[PDB]
UniProtKB/Swiss-Prot annotation, chain A:
InterPro entries: Cwf_Cwc_15 (IPR006973)
Family: Belongs to the CWC15 family.
Location in or out of the cell: Nucleus
Natural source organism: Saccharomyces cerevisiae (strain ATCC 204508 / S288c)
Pfam families: Cwf_Cwc_15
Protein name from the UniProt record: Pre-mRNA-splicing factor CWC15
Role, per record: Involved in pre-mRNA splicing.
Lineage: Eukaryota, Fungi, Dikarya, Ascomycota, Saccharomycotina
Region (Disordered): 1-18
Subunit organization: Belongs to the CWC complex (or CEF1-associated complex), a spliceosome sub-complex reminiscent of a late-stage spliceosome composed of the U2, U5 and U6 snRNAs and at least BUD13, BRR2, CDC40, CEF1, CLF1, CUS1, CWC2, CWC15, CWC21, CWC22, CWC23, CWC24, CWC25, CWC27, ECM2, HSH155, IST3, ISY1, LEA1, MSL1, NTC20, PRP8, PRP9, PRP11, PRP19, PRP21, PRP22, PRP45, PRP46, SLU7, SMB1, SMD1, SMD2, SMD3, SMX2, SMX3, SNT309, SNU114, SPP2, SYF1, SYF2, RSE1 and YJU2.
Protein origin, superkingdom: Eukaryota
Swiss-Prot record, chain H:
Subcellular location: Cytoplasm; Nucleus
Protein's recorded name: Pre-mRNA-splicing factor CEF1
Recorded name of the encoding gene: CEF1
Entry function: Involved in pre-mRNA splicing and cell cycle control. Required for the binding of the NTC complex (or PRP19-associated complex) components to the spliceosome to mediate conformational rearrangement or to stabilize the structure of the spliceosome after U4 snRNA dissociation, which leads to spliceosome maturation. Its absence leads to an arrest of the cell cycle, possibly due to the inefficient splicing of TUB1.
Covered range of the whole protein: 9 to 111 of 590
Misc: Present with 784 molecules/cell in log phase SD medium.
Native source species: Saccharomyces cerevisiae (strain ATCC 204508 / S288c)
Signal peptide interval: none
Domain annotation HTH myb-type: ranges: 1-52, 55-102
Amino acid sequence: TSHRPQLEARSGAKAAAYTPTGIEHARLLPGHTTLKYRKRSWRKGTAFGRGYINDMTKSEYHQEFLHKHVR
Amino acid sequence: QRTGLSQIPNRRFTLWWSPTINRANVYVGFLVQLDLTGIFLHGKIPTL
Amino acid sequence: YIGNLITRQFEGRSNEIVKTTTKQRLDAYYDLELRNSVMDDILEMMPESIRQKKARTILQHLSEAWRCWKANIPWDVPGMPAPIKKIIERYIKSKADAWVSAAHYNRERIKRGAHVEKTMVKKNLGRLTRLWIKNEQERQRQIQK
Amino acid sequence: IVNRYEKLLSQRPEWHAPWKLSRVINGHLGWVRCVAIDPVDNEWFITGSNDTTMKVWDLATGKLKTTLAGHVMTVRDVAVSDRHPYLFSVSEDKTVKCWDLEKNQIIRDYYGHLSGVRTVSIHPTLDLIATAGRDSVIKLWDMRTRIPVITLVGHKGPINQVQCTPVDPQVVSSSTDATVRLWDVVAGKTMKVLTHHKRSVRATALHPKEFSVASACTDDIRSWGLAEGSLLTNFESEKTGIINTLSINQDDVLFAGGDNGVLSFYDYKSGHKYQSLATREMVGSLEGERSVLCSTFDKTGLRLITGEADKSIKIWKQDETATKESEPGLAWNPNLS
Amino acid sequence: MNYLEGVGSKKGGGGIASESQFNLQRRKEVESLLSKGENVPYTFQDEQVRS
Amino acid sequence: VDITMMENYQNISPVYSVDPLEKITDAYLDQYLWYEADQRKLFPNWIK
Amino acid sequence: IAKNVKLDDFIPKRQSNFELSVPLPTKAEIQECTARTKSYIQRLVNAKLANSNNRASSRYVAPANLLLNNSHHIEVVSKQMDPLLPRFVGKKARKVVAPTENDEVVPVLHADPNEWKIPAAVSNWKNPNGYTENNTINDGFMKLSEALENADKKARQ
Amino acid sequence: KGGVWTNVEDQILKAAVQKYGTHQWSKVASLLQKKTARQSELRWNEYLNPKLNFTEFSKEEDAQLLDLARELPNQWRTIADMMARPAQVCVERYNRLLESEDS
Amino acid sequence: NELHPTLPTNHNKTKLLKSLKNTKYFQQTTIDWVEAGLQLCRQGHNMLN
Amino acid sequence: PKDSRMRLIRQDVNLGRAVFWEIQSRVPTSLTSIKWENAFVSVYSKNN
Amino acid sequence: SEEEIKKFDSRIRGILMASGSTTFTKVAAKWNTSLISLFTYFREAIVA
Amino acid sequence: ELLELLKSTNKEIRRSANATFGFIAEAIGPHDVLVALLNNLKVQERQLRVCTAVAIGIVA
Amino acid sequence: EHPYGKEVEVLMETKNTQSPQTPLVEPVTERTKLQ
Ligand SMILES: [Mg+2]
């Protein structure tokens, strides 16, 4: 039971600085500094001769999956 | 003690080929001496 | 680098360090977002009863409805109100949608030879066993039907 | 005062045409959580989803243009600027990302939220963005230097919505503590606290012409003038349930989408509900999956886009053949309390 | 390379207990199940009403 | 019967574990039925 | 009781007249807020680029006191610091619990229990420390075994 | 090959299943000295679940049983799902009902 | 190196050693090179200790 | 290699489809599924 | 066959993941069984 | 450890383990050895209880 | 289909009709360049 997150401001009112301690992070280094503005005897011999659904697991894509990777 | 695999075969193998595995080789600026011995270790090799 | 190390010596390491969503804490973070989103939708349907005592009970039915989807057992609580039942069903289907498509995504990496961790290869076979049995039980039910 | 209420049947609200469905688009693997129209040309719209991707869709034909990968958790809000070729996307993995459209790549990252971010708003005239979420603060970012220049503290619960306006109040916010706060950002403090909603306020939308905000609680939709903390109208939103999204049109049509799948249309000046529709889900979907999660009107204001909990995009259209006489509203009976 | 195997130990333990100690554990667990957990008083204890 | 899956990386494959006392009867009946079909020539020459 | 809450603030304003006009701010009134808010934000960017202890990041950037009775005068001078010394010698990471803000409180201005009763969760999988098919046969099954029993009797005769 | 359940072991199963539930059979085995986890699962499903049906068959059950045992010749777990009775009871009742036809 | 040129930016004329000689705390002299390098060995050994 | 596979020629390609057509009709699909996707038909002739 | 080239590669992946694959001679012994079982089965077909 | 050796089905092992509790008690004293022996009297098994009763009289 | 019925286009879309490098906002060049 987490039951509540941490409100940000209890970090933000801490008196290290307005800034952090003075740690310089690599992702906070400068970059992208310029903003961009928009302007027949053999045949007779035998006996038997002559949708998109909204569910993952009941789909056609899923049963072709389980037919290939469970062999 | 039931599932984990015994260390004793790796140590057996490593001790056997240890003058080739722990060979003086090329100088890297210094060498580490094993305490209470005069055995020099020429790499950081834990099974040896 | 030396500037960062020296700043920590005289000023200390800040207590406001926010840790990112990495691959080792992804399942924990999905949990907290689904747990907060289910309590929001149910507490807005309730008139003016209570907030603290019922809440732990509601999240126990959610964890139980997820153990039933994985076991392929129907989840029926006899005296549960119908709008609380439809919120838990909607959110169990959303978790299951993520669970299945992540199993397909990781099985195709294992096939094509891409490097996957040993714990994640093993978690994949467990998911694809339960998915395989569910197709097998649905195949049996239809031949009876 | 009831003599004034005797006069109230002499206004008789303006008639709007009823809306109907024209296109159903499938293609996300999870719920469709957020939507934004191209605010210049209407050539496309963009949708983020529960399956962690964003997709770009042709507006006229419905076709899928491109897929944008780039978050590990649900993408909860997106924003496209009037002035820049920039896309701002927010997620549940605590990250804010800027996307240069001209390359379809991520160019800027924003760091500092303790937990998941739910809203992003672009300021109309400044080069500044506003984000908020579960941490109960609003952060104002410098778009150029990527710096959290201002942090707004006040709300006691997770923040649901943030809007931006050119004059004071610069930032409007609504949270789960049932309040709407208006912000003075240079002093960093609350200009006005609107306390009338009884529960968590999920949706806001600003009027495109009148300089006003609407907010929705469960069964409770109220409109507000932004010059003063003053209630303009209460709406006939009774029995309508949880409201997930709100949309205001140029022609004074307020759309309210709800968790029961019922589309609800309102006249903005009066608050009169003139139409109620119901969505049909899909084949194979649950009755709980009949709900409306996001909405936007297009720039002309005659097509409504909705993304839903059954992983689909529904495009709604207003009827041109339906003139006034055979399509009246829903019986304007203004009841009493 | 050892970390692949995935098997650990907590430091400072004593091992598996003896079977006479599992037999004392189980025999107490069976009685409290069948008793439904009720406390039996002793005759010498100079007397909550029991079932 | 218990079922588990084998990792083969391209597919997974099921393995069935039957009860041990029942396996003694089934293993006898397997040997007995193939011995009699071979004596009595049930299966013709093309079956592999 | 009195000075805080009123009756006009309960009631809306377009309730009487629907044609009440809330206008846009104006072209001039937006440009005045635009200038001074942008001026405040660059003051905060430059104060935050200049305190990061980077020589590299800083390319992107009065007496002021009289006496209480205006008795003497005061000239305020900033001292120039040794660049090798730890700048902001008072600076150190500390936790500060902050009191409640001074502004007063705003007024809040706002059967089924047997329907909304939640049952107790009891799980088959987990136990807390404390407080310890309808459908009949299809007819194709009926008709398969009749056919196979006729062919069996007809063949054996 | 024994598998003898004394009646005190039946009482320890029912009380043990009331505590640990129906999926934690290794806890249920931790209370039994002489039984395994699969042995405990098998007696609950076939004997000791109080939802099972061990009563005498009525006359319309026997006409349902002889009917099914001719359509699905030997499929005794499929027949027992339809009778909603344990499988071993349906088999014994089937054999006795064929020996009621006897000289 | 010819395929991926990295161009200098025109704004950067600040130059660490010129901004450091503006203050009180640094002075100039002229010494031998072997003396200057033997000082930096002594100085860097103090910093690490 | 392409020189030494089956040559896709109308007289031969149709013969391969006709032979498979004749065989799939002889087994009822309730027993097994014989599919063209899982089949290989090699033809030897003047052109192959 | 291509299908059984992939079966052999998935066998080598399985060897490098099993319990005991940290013991050096165990890994070598499994390399020899699967390499022998490949070469003594196909024998000539490996060449081309 | 000698306490775990009393479960042996050999009578030499049990007999010489009980002699060893005597030698250990003569060195380090009775009362550390008495407590482990007294707590071993709570087992169900008779071999274990009879061998700890011998050992207590040796320590005495 | 029939859930919506008559006047509704229902389309399932699994393929991007464009390439993964199209600008999706055309760069505006104020001048014409011939180099
Ligand atoms: Mg460990």
